[PDB]
Structure formats: C-alpha cells, structure tokens
UniProtKB/Swiss-Prot annotation:
Span list, region Cysteine-rich: 22-37
Modified residues (Asymmetric dimethylarginine): 52-53
Name of the featured protein: Protein Tat
Species of the source: Human immunodeficiency virus type 1 group M subtype D (isolate Z2/CDC-Z34)
Gene expressing this chain: tat
Function, as annotated: Transcriptional activator that increases RNA Pol II processivity, thereby increasing the level of full-length viral transcripts. Recognizes a hairpin structure at the 5'-LTR of the nascent viral mRNAs referred to as the transactivation responsive RNA element (TAR) and recruits the cyclin T1-CDK9 complex (P-TEFb complex) that will in turn hyperphosphorylate the RNA polymerase II to allow efficient elongation. The CDK9 component of P-TEFb and other Tat-activated kinases hyperphosphorylate the C-terminus of RNA Pol II that becomes stabilized and much more processive. Extracellular circulating Tat can be endocytosed by surrounding uninfected cells via the binding to several surface receptors such as CD26, CXCR4, heparan sulfate proteoglycans (HSPG) or LDLR. Neurons are rarely infected, but they internalize Tat via their LDLR. Through its interaction with nuclear HATs, Tat is potentially able to control the acetylation-dependent cellular gene expression. Modulates the expression of many cellular genes involved in cell survival, proliferation or in coding for cytokines or cytokine receptors. Tat plays a role in T-cell and neurons apoptosis.
Amino acid sequence: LDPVDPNIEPWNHPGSQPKTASNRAHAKKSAYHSQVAFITKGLGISYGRKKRRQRRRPSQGGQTHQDPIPKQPSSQPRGDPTGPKE
C-alpha cells in the first residue's frame, strides 16, 4: 500500500456509471465517502485519512475524479469523452 500515492490511482470515473449511476447506483458510493482503494485500505471508512493523500487535487487529465474535484468535471466536458458529461 502507499506505493506511488494510492494503490493503483483508481480516481478516474467513466462519467457514465459513478456519475450516471443508472448502470449500478450502489457499489459506487457504497456508503463510505467513496475514495475507492487509494493510499490506505478501508476506502476512507475510518483508518485515519489526511485529505492531502491524493497530492494532485488540481490535477486530473480527463480523469473524472471524485473527492479532489467534486465541484465540477473540469476535464470531462472539455477533455476525455467520458459519456454524458460533454
């Protein structure tokens, strides 16, 4: 764990599943503030998060983040074609 930053940097949504949630709407948010398998296991449940564990809040690249840029897509509507976020 905590290799580069998270385990595999799974902070990238298709903009058509975790955002649309019509395809699932349950395991995505799974009642744990989301965060997926990032720098620590538990998925931000309560191991002792630090918020800056991403070290790339202002960095995306058509990544479609969730905790670092929940304010806006800032990459889907003007970068990678996620789905309906264009």
